[PDB]
Design a protein around this ligand. Structure first.
Ligand code: 2PG
Ligand code: MN
Ligand code: MN
Length: 508
């Protein structure tokens, strides 16, 4: 059994500038020798090359979606942007049905989601659009529950988004900031229900740090070293001390996040008839008209503003169609990406598809444990390899990305070095079994964890990702894109390429 392994170094991209560049500064003997001894190239992992607006940096969802589809996969950010551009956004039956619900039943419209222009999980402009739509539709009570970013944008940039939103509110003549919470709580994806609950109780019970002024809230949190991403779920109150608004029975909610991994948990908390993760309390809200900007999960009992579209014949499906055994493996943080997103937005495994989930460390932030669970993932996978069970493997090492999001150089360097020690063990074990490895990344991040002035850089970058095919005697094209990865693997696998995969094998 000669396995072909797709190894994704999450957040590992190529950048000449070495300042604050953890990828370039890390000692990567393994990665370096493979780059030197095998055919390599780089791929466009951002902008139109991956289905996003030009200039928009990539991410795990976009990257893994494109990597597995073998075609340029059109993304939500782009599609919704166009909807707003073409005057289609205001015509959305779901947005309107939700607005009709509050007016007809005299309830309130709640708007929550990532408050920034990161463009990864949402865009603050989409919120402005909903607000103007709400005003246009004559919806009296509209409340904003903002989730502070700091991960897709500057670590202490909330004030400007809050400031701009307030200005927009005044201008549209509708809306009220009710709560402010760090995406660390309201947008968790690691089933850390303790985090989720904090966000939930602030929004439904007005429990959490209280302020009259949204900006005084952020100021106070900064004062305690707590920045945007980790801001404690707080409540904005009126002059009489009462919360500006809590989510109640028959209210409508429009979750304006278009990325699913970090939206399913809080969405389930609000819509699940029987929720057990934790006790929502007897007076928790029911009969909520819940709207998801895009599809999150079958579990969320709500509606979908922008319906999803099938992604047929992705690598996972082609591999399955030809009777091959495939294994998806990664630790928690990137488990959703190597499965759901890699499978083209599919939850169910394909026949013949095995998945291994290795739990990420129990640390608040990963700069605290840069090697994360890389070694366990590696150990786990090395065993599978000895077993001779899989024809195809899709491995994702989360470290470069996960610890690079801390905006810290030394821990990210360690992160990269840990992954390298691991990368060598895996590629060396695959070559020994006669297989071949495709070493790559889904986008940048670790290549820049410090701003030119040395401040923490906590988000992705727009640089190109590396590509190494451990097969002597071949040449790789140069202007490729992620959507070319699937075709290359199939080529290596000698499996035929489906017409759906409009990508092109990198092998000359
Ligand atoms: O952590 C996340 O949700 C994003 C950043 O907002 O990173 P990635 O796309 O790598 O998952
Ligand atoms: Mn990623
Ligand atoms: Mn990331």
């Amino acid at each position: 059994k000669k396995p072909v392994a797709l190894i994704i170094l999450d957040g590992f991209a190529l950048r000449d500038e070495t300042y604050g560049n953890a990828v370039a500064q890390a000692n990567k003997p393994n990665f370096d020798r493979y780059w030197n001894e095998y055919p390599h190239t780089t791929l466009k992992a951002c902008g139109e090359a991956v289905g996003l607006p030009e200039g928009q940096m990539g991410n795990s969802e976009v990257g893994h979606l494109n990597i597995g589809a073998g075609r340029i996969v059109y993304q939500s950010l782009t599609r919704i942007n166009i909807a707003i551009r073409e005057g289609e956004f205001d015509r959305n039956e779901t947005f309107l049905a939700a607005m009709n619900h509050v007016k007809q039943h005299g309830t309130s419209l709640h708007l929550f989601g990532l408050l920034s222009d990161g463009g990864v999980h949402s865009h603050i402009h989409h919120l402005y659009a909903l607000l103007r739509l709400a005003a246009k539709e004559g919806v009296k009570r509209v409340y904003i529950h903002g989730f502070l970013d700091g991960r897709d944008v500057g670590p202490q940039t909330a004030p400007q988004y809050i400031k701009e939103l307030q200005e927009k509110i005044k201008e549209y003549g509708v809306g009220e900031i009710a709560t402010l919470s760090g995406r660390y709580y309201s947008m968790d994806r690691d089933k850390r229900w303790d985090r989720v609950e904090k966000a939930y109780r602030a929004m439904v019970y007005g429990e959490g740090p209280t302020y009259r002024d949204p900006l005084e809230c952020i100021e106070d949190s900064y004062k305690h070293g707590i920045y945007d991403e980790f801001v404690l779920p707080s409540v904005i109150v009126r002059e009489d001390g009462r919360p500006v608004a809590t989510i109640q029975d028959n209210d409508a909610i429009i979750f304006y996040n278009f990325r699913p991994d970090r939206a399913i948990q809080i969405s389930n908390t609000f819509t699940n008839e029987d929720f057990r993760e934790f006790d929502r309390g007897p007076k928790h809200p029911k009969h909520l008209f819940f709207v998801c900007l895009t599809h999150f999960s079958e579990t969320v009992a709500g509606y979908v503003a922008f319906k999803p579209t099938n992604l047929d014949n992705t690598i996972g499906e082609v591999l399955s169609q030809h009777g091959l055994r495939q294994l998806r493996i990664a630790e928690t943080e990137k488990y959703p990406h190597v499965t759901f997103f890699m499978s083209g937005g599919r939850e169910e495994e394909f026949p013949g598809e095995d998945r291994i989930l290795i739990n990420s460390p129990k640390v608040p932030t990963y700069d605290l444990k840069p090697e994360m669970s890389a070694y366990e993932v590696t150990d786990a996978l090395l065993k599978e390899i000895e077993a001779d069970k899989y024809d195809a493997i899709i491995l994702n090492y989360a470290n470069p990305d996960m610890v690079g999001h801390s905006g810290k150089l030394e821990p990210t360097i360690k992160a990269v070095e840990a992954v390298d020690e691991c990368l060598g063990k895996v590629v060396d074990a695959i070559l020994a079994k006669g297989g071949i490895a495709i070493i790559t990344a889904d986008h940048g991040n670790a290549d820049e964890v410090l701003t030119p002035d040395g401040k923490p850089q906590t988000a992705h970058t727009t640089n190109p990702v590396p590509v190494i095919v451990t097969k002597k005697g071949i040449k790789l094209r140069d202007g490729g894109i992620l959507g070319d990865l699937a075709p290359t693997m199939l080529d290596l696998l000698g499996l035929p390429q489906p017409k759906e995969m409009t990508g092109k094998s990198l092998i000359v």
